[PDB]
Amino acid sequence: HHHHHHMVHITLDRNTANSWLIISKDRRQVRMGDTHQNVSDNKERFSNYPMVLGAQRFSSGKMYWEVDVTQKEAWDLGVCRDSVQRKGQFSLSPENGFWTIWLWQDSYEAGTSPQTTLHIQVPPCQIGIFVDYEAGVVSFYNITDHGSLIYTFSECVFAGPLRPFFNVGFNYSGGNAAPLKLCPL
Numbered sequence: 621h622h623h624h625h626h627m628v629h630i631t632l633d634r635n636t637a638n639s640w641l642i643i644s645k646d647r648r649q650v651r652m653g654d655t656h657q658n659v660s661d662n663k664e665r666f667s668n669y670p671m672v673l674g675a676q677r678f679s680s681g682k683m684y685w686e687v688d689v690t691q692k693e694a695w696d697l698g699v700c701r702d703s704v705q706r707k708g709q710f711s712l713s714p715e716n717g718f719w720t721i722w723l724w725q726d727s728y729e730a731g732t733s734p735q736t737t738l739h740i741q742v743p744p745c746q747i748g749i750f751v752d753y754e755a756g757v758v759s760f761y762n763i764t765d766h767g768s769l770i771y772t773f774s775e776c777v778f779a780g781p782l783r784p785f786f787n788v789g790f791n792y793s794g795g796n797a798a799p800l801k802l803c804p805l
């Protein structure tokens with residue numbers, strides 16, 4: 621793809637993080653802690669899942685960023701409305717304000733309702749995410765496989781400002797402790 625010149629510097633917003641997440645000093649990495657990280661609760665924190673938002677809000681233009689997912693067994697990535705539900709149980713869908721893909725149990729799926737099977741021959745170590753606000757597009761790219769297309773959400777109805785969205789996943793298996801990392805430009 622040729623989206624690299626729309627690169628944006630994303631940082632993670634601590635205040636939105638599930639209380640078990642550990643965000644690095646530079647706000648560019650996040651991992652699941654083995655316990656509560658000793659922060660106060662607030663109405664913004666994701667309560668049920670190991671999720672966090674980027675600080676940046678997008679309401680126009682074209683944006684591109686990359687995320688490192690090396691050795692993880694489970695994660696969700698994409699964008700979401702600024703006003704998505706934070707508390708309780710919910711599914712990742714455009715109806716609920718999410719445009720995402722994930723890895724779960726050795727399969728990759730797009731967060732449509734119902735979910736869509738993805739066809740990935742080369743397991744990605746880094747994912748590229750492209751948003752075209754005006755066109756209503758969110759696309760995902762396999763950086764490990766020379767930028768090949770993973771999935772395009774088109775005819776998106778964003779209906780609000782967008783934020784970068786991350787889920788590091790649970791670590792019940794002991795094989796999913798590795799971080800998500802925002803890759804340098």
Ligand SMILES: CCc1csc(-c2cnc[nH]2)n1
Pocket residue numbers: 669710711712790
């Ligand atoms: C919306 C994120 C979500 C729904 S259910 C779920 C889960 C992860 N592991 C077991 N269940 N995560």
Ligand SMILES: CCc1csc(-c2cnc[nH]2)n1
Pocket residue numbers: none
């Ligand atoms: C890792 C996927 C896998 C292993 S063995 C297998 C399969 C065997 N027979 C049909 N399908 N699929």
